[PDB]
Amino acid sequence: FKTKGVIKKRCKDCYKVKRRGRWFILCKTNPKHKQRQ
Template structure:
């Protein structure tokens, strides 16, 4: 699985889904599997404002 900051559909069979706040691309072709990077930046700033 490729981990990228920007995920895109590569072929017509690719599907974009969201699981637990992350965006995934799943496809019949295993080479097209992708996951978007987590951004811990936004979470840390929200917790520190408390």
Template sequence: MNFLANTLRQSLARSSLYLRPIGINSLIREDPALRTTNVFLQPAQLPTLTLVSGFKVRFAVKRRCKDCYMVVRDGRMYNICPTHRRHKQMSFTPSQKTLNTKNITWAGQSKIRPW
């Protein structure tokens, strides 16, 4: 019974909010979200980003256009292009080449399969 009484009170309280006359001025005064819309309409201050293309790491560094040139620094071969920044490449170091190799323990090629 107590549950029904509480539900009835809540529904009457909600309906009284909807039944009273509301003017535009009273709506703006009462609703804090409508008062602060000016802040939300201002342009957002976003950080400026500088787009930089990094080096592509390759085993075989190649020239991709006539403006690309090769440079050797710290035991690596670099391809640098002043006109197309996306052509930048650098080679693996010898230690990286050994990390990326795989040891094949067994390989067989025959016309008859063992299974």
């Protein structure tokens, strides 16, 4: 989890969710791609 000002999808499998009051991109293939706002 890197917290970034602007969140961007990084690969095809990346998907976006709204958990606990923030936007997350989570990638099953590459955990590196996980991001938080």
